[PDB]
Amino acid sequence: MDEILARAGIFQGVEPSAIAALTKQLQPVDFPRGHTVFAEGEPGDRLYIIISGKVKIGRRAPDGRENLLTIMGPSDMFGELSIFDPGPRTSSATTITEVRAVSMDRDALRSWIADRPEISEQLLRVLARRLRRTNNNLADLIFTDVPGRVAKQLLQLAQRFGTQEGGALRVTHDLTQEEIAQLVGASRETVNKALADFAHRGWIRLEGKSVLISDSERLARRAR
Amino acid sequence: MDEILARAGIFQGVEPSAIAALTKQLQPVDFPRGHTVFAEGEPGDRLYIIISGKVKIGRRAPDGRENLLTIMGPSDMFGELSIFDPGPRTSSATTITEVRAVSMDRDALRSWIADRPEISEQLLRVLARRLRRTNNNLADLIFTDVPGRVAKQLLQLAQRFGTQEGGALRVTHDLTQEEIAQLVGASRETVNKALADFAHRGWIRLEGKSVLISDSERLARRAR
Numbered sequence A, B: 001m002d003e004i005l006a007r008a009g010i011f012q013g014v015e016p017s018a019i020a021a022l023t024k025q026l027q028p029v030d031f032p033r034g035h036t037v038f039a040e041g042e043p044g045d046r047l048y049i050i051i052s053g054k055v056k057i058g059r060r061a062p063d064g065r066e067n068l069l070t071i072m073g074p075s076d077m078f079g080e081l082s083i084f085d086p087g088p089r090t091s092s093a094t095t096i097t098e099v100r101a102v103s104m105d106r107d108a109l110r111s112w113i114a115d116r117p118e119i120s121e122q123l124l125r126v127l128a129r130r131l132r133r134t135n136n137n138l139a140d141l142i143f144t145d146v147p148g149r150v151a152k153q154l155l156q157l158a159q160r161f162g163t164q165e166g167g168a169l170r171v172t173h174d175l176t177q178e179e180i181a182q183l184v185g186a187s188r189e190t191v192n193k194a195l196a197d198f199a200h201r202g203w204i205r206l207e208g209k210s211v212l213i214s215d216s217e218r219l220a221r222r223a224r
């Protein structure tokens, strides 16, 4: 599991042999599927790295309507925004499978950067990347229509969690039909038809909390 | 000049007798109104701090339509994202006034960070905060009604540019009709209907490029 940790935004760029010498006394946590690790708006000082399982990053309207910002998995950090720009959690963080993680608090995190200055530019790198992704997600809402947007999401899910079957990519995305619409940021029926059409043409084939992508090249053409 | 450069964000962590050191190294520049500093897509080795003027950071749709990510004024840093996660600019940076600014580049920047790790700690704060704002705008798009957004937007312009002018607020945003629209991520058509509604509910008034705000509460209610 040290192997999964070493793939972090933090542990990337700290001498790999020395990554052993530091991974010791962190608090390692467990969560059942469905656990609110923390809620949007509340204070918090902990940052987590996912050892195993997937966490969904949610945003909730006063109205009661839900929205998913991104899905995190093995090796992804979450809960760092309220640390770096001190303030409240910018969103809810909810487990999607059972989840093994490892957390560290604000001060523990201070030791780390002081002793291993390299971390900061990787941390900078993660937020910058996330900015880029979010910038895109945002423009997609102003500009891209639903099936176009579903295409992007499956594709993004696939670069992040996809495995190979041969020519085709497996995407065990551990999601419900409503969470997928929630990532896409549009109606549930509408996301399902967009998905049905793509299945129709054997571009994708749906199976449980999972999708198999046959024809990524056309898929990527519905994106745009 | 140097006290606007002191409130930059990069610099909120260095000795008073150091900002001067880092200020020499910097390269003064004077862009005219309607100048493109760089454009979404170009390579980027260079980051900017606006001494004065305002600049719009923008993204263009395939349809030729354009959403404005933010407006930037004295002390603001921009073009940092291609330093931390090297790649193209995610967005264009175009003046909406004459501008005098100050630039520094990837190697200059990296040298400073090895010299003074505090700079890292500060750009994380800046990035995280940028990411916090964007989650709010993004979610405004799924969750918040169309003039509902024009509220939060005017006030935010205010928070950042608002001058108390006889019990009211003086915001010289320097945005044309369309430019305000693009911040809200909408068509002039439905935006200028919030021009007219706030014109005969008398909370503002279109004076020059500027705008004078006389309300506050029937906005923080009108937004939330």
Ligand SMILES: Nc1ncnc2c1ncn2[C@@H]1O[C@@H]2COP(=O)(O)O[C@H]2[C@H]1O
Binding pocket: A057, A069, A070, A077, A078, A079, A080, A081, A082, A083, A088, A089, A090, A091, A092, A093, A130, A131, A134, B131, B135
């Ligand atoms: N736009 C985004 N892209 C990627 N991750 C995000 C985004 N918004 C929030 N998160 C993550 O979800 C976390 C919720 O808690 P924090 O706001 O402390 O830190 C946040 C980030 O780690």
Ligand SMILES: Nc1ncnc2c1ncn2[C@@H]1O[C@@H]2COP(=O)(O)O[C@H]2[C@H]1O
Binding pocket: A131, A135, B044, B057, B069, B070, B077, B078, B079, B080, B081, B082, B083, B088, B089, B090, B091, B092, B093, B130, B134
């Ligand atoms: N969401 C955002 N909020 C504020 N500024 C941004 C945002 N997205 C991009 N930018 C700025 O726009 C700049 C364009 O050039 P870079 O991508 O190098 O760096 C980018 C950031 O400085």
